[PDB]
């Protein structure tokens, strides 16, 4: 706010207000919100699966 940090580097999603007050540079990295899940384990019933 008081311009005591000339360069601002951090994980910062380019939001509407942030672009409104900071003319942000071109995006270093393109990304978005993703969903997370546990890997589905393979329920092996053994060799005698029939």
């Amino acid at each position: 706010i008081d311009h005591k940090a000339d360069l601002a580097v951090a994980p910062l999603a380019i939001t509407y207000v942030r672009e409104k007050v900071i003319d942000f540079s071109k995006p270093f990295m393109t990304l978005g919100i993703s969903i997370l899940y546990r890997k589905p384990n393979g329920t092996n019933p053994g060799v005698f699966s029939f």
Partner: protein
């Protein structure tokens, strides 16, 4: 000998029909359900808990989202704020690990985590438009100099290597990508083993006499 042969044949037909019907039902119910939940479409599911970091970027995005797929997710998260929402990223990862719970988080953090440990997966991805970059509160020219540095940095190959070595970490075991619907070796090999056992027992009892 006619009656016994006929009844044995009828019994064989009934047994093979029942076995095939039951196996077909089992495989059909296995294949009908997707191995994962509906990718990025946890609506109409309401069984796997899902949420994001409390008052985070994903939480804020889902608050101001009017898409039919995401407004239902926001309503579910708000109705269960004390349960699905978590304070920190590591808390969310632990909650996903400990119980049936899906988490919504920035893509770079998801890939970083799923590369750190391979007991976790990233289902969809890039369902939101955002990016990371440096900034300057004033309309200075040196930020534009930084932007031209960005473009000249991507014009040659240096970003990918440093990005990967910062996310590679430890090795991850190989996993399937496009495996078909054929039976696995472990799925059927039992009949092969029992056939071999029966054959060797028959050979032994034949050579015994």
């Amino acid at each position: 000998t006619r009656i016994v042969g006929g009844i044995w044949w009828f019994f064989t037909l009934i047994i093979i029909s029942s076995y095939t019907a039951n196996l077909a039902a089992f495989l059909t119910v296995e294949r009908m359900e997707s191995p994962i939940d509906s990718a990025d479409d946890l609506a109409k599911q309401t069984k796997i808990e899902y949420g994001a970091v409390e008052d985070g970027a994903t939480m804020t995005f889902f608050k101001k989202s009017k898409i039919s797929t995401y407004d239902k997710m926001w309503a579910f998260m708000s109705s269960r704020r004390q349960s699905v929402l978590v304070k920190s990223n590591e808390e969310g990862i632990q909650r996903v690990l400990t119980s049936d719970y899906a988490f919504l988080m920035e893509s770079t953090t998801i890939e970083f985590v799923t590369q750190r440990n391979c007991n976790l997966t990233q289902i969809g991805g890039l369902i939101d438009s955002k990016g990371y970059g440096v900034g300057t509160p004033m309309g200075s020219p040196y930020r534009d100099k930084i932007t031209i540095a960005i473009l000249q940095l991507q014009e040659e190959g240096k970003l990918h290597m440093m990005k990967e070595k910062w996310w590679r970490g430890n090795g991850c075991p190989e996993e399937e990508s496009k495996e078909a619907s054929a039976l696995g070796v472990q799925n059927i090999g039992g009949i092969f083993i029992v056939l071999a056992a029966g054959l060797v027992l028959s050979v032994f009892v034949a050579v015994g006499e």
